[PDB]
Amino acid sequence: MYYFIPSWSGSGKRVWHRDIIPWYRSMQRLEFDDTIHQIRIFHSENLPVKLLLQAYMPHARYFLHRQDIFETEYYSVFDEIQAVESNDMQVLQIKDLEWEDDCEFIYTPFLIIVRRQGQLYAHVEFGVEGFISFIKFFKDDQLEKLNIFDDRGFVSSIVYYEDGQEVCQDYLNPNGDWRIREYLKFENSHVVVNPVFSRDFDKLEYECMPDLILEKLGYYISHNVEEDSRFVVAAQPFTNQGVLDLLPQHSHSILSFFHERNQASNIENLKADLEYADLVLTDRMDFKETLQNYFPLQAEKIHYLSPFDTRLQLGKSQQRHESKIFYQIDLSELLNDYAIFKVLFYVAQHPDTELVIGVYNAWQEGIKQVENKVEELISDYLDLKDFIKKLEYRFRIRNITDELSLIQELDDTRLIIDLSQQPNLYTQIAGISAGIPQINLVASDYVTHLQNGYILDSISQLAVAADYYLQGLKNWNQALIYSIEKIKLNTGHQVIKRWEKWLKEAIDEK
């Protein structure tokens, strides 16, 4: 069986605590997490797989539903702490909570306000799907308590504040009783167990919560995982030691690097994880390059490889008159003004094309940047008249924040352009799945020149590649063929094949 250890951490000083965010500050995203996408693959191939959840996730069920990995069996370290012996969901109504008898409830486009004789009493808050998330309690206009709710329907933990400052946190059990209390001040930064529960904990007091966590999870790995099991660890940007050390000697490890998590990672801090691990996966050609060049002793086991499935989802672009061009912009780089222009120039001079400039997960600052740079560049070099479709214009800018929306865009798309240094892997994977030829500036496993795609010597040569697929049908039909060959050669079945192969070579070369 495969075991997946995610890195589903928080942003605060307490990594192992998940951010609690009201619905109206949860921006909708296309989560590119390796572990999510690697897991979906396992379900797709109907294979056994378990999640070892290191962190404290009171809303882990709604999190799991939103990533369409609800199905996944998980062991939760914090639920062992809190003695949660059921995943039986029981979604709580506003009414079935213990309220003083004189409480008046005021509704808001954002939350609910509870008052007791006109006095502030509680802010009641909700998550993405309208489950009670947390209630904020008050004592004369100061924050007394914060009751964090579990999405299965009971208060998970309680934060006690003094003078608007975190003091301590009481992780409860489904009945109500504190199992542990973590102190949250600089003063005391450690965790003490309720004596009634000495059965369940080794010590009665811990220096850091990362002790408790690594205690319980360490026990599970040495008492429930059968021999030969495989472990996939999402590399933390720092040492993954307090986890890689808990793994049996009769196991195999994969260290997976996700670029959004590992881009500014403490590179030398991982010296030893790269020495432990059987396989090391990243999503960036250049992350691979650095690892190899920084640590030659591990160079051979580091692999660039997509965590994204290639389905078969051929688009209907032959059923179309205008050639639709999907241009992938990476907002993480500086915009390449020459390259944006070169795509705009091409579309400008070809009335039977249209353009979608696509970006993923964009702040609307970043949208205003992409919009303004095209108005600026069209203004400063081209005639906006030529973009009028013979007051509707032949280019737009699409912020993609859904997987279903990218598919929808790509269906009738006829050509993909990604002029970036690191061509966006996901678009490459969804493009293959739709049979769209892909124009690209740098070579890649996933776009092979004059096969499913054209690799430019230079941005200076874009038109030649665009003419190649848009003039006639010959070249584009041939490319469609090679994208099917790439489609079959990179499905879920094909990923775990590649994983399992790389592994069995590491076993063998010893």
Q: Which residue range forms the structural domain that includes residue 171?
A: 103-189
User: Residue 505 falls within a domain, yes or no?
Assistant: no
244 and 352, same domain (yes or no): no
130 and 220, same domain (yes or no): no
CATH number of the domain where residue 288 is located: 3.40.50
Residue 9's alpha-carbon distances to 12, 63, 69, 393, in angstroms, are: 9, 13, 18, 43
Tokens standing for residue 317: 């672009």
Domain endpoint, select from 269, 304, 339: 304
User: Residue 116 falls within a domain, yes or no?
Assistant: yes
Mutual angle of helices 474-488 and 425-434, in 10-degree steps = 110
User: Residue 91 falls within a domain, yes or no?
Assistant: no
Amino acid sitting at position 100:
E
Amino acid sitting at position 266:
N
280 and 396, same domain (yes or no): no
Contacts of 394 (CB under 8 A, 6+ apart): 347, 351, 353, 354, 355, 387, 388
* Region for 206 from its dihedrals, namely left if φ exceeds 0, alpha if ψ lies in -120 to 50, beta otherwise: beta
400 and 437, same domain (yes or no): yes
Q: Tell me how far apart the terminal alpha carbons of the chain are, to the nearest angstrom.
A: 23
> What's the full length of the chain, in residues?
510
Residue 17 DSSP class: B
On whether the CB atoms of residues 163 and 139 are closer than 8 A, the answer is no
If we measure between CA atoms, which residue out of 54, 52, 53, 47 comes closest to residue 1?
47
* Distance in angstroms (rounded) separating the CA atoms of residues 431 and 327: 12
Residue 241's alpha-carbon distances to 84, 103, 207, 234, 296, in angstroms, are: 27, 50, 18, 12, 20
User: Residue 353 falls within a domain, yes or no?
Assistant: yes
481 and 366, same domain (yes or no): yes
Residue 371's alpha-carbon distances to 328, 353, 360, 395, 398, in angstroms, are: 14, 19, 14, 11, 10
User: Residue 206 falls within a domain, yes or no?
Assistant: no
Listing DSSP states for 176-215 in one string gives S-EEEEEE-SSS---EEE-GGGTTT-SSSEESSHHHHHHH
> How wide is the angle at C-alpha 254 spanned by C-alphas 69 and 280, nearest 5°?
120
359 and 288, same domain (yes or no): no
Amino acid sitting at position 409:
E
Domain count for the chain, please give it.
3
Bridge partners, residue 205, by sequence: 192
Amino acid sitting at position 379:
S
Number of neighbouring beta carbons within 10 Å of residue 133:
23
154 and 222, same domain (yes or no): no
User: Residue 222 falls within a domain, yes or no?
Assistant: yes
User: Residue 504 falls within a domain, yes or no?
Assistant: no
Contacts of 33 (CB under 8 A, 6+ apart): 6, 67, 234, 258
For residue 253, the Cα-to-chain-centroid distance in whole angstroms is: 21
* Distance in angstroms (rounded) separating the CA atoms of residues 374 and 494: 40
User: Residue 404 falls within a domain, yes or no?
Assistant: yes
185 and 221, same domain (yes or no): no
Bridge partners, residue 147, by sequence: 135, 158
409 and 296, same domain (yes or no): no
3-state secondary structure of 158: strand
Tokens standing for residue 43: 């379900």
On whether the CB atoms of residues 151 and 60 are closer than 8 A, the answer is yes
Resolution of the structure, angstroms: 2.8
147 and 181, same domain (yes or no): yes
On whether the CB atoms of residues 58 and 92 are closer than 8 A, the answer is no
Residue 255's alpha-carbon distances to 231, 291, 304, in angstroms, are: 9, 12, 12
How would you class 86 by CB atoms within 10 Å of its CB: exposed for 0-12, middle for 13-18, buried for 19 or more? exposed
Phi, psi of 10 (to 5 degrees): -90, 175
3-state secondary structure of 26: coil
> How do 353-360 and 453-455 pair as beta strands?
unpaired
Q: Give start and end residues of each alpha helix (H) in 349-390.
A: 364-381
Bridge partners, residue 231, by sequence: 3, 253
32 and 112, same domain (yes or no): no
- Structure-determination approach: X-ray
- Tokens 């590491």 identify what position? 506
* Region for 462 from its dihedrals, namely left if φ exceeds 0, alpha if ψ lies in -120 to 50, beta otherwise: alpha
Phi, psi of 362 (to 5 degrees): -95, 130
62 and 182, same domain (yes or no): no
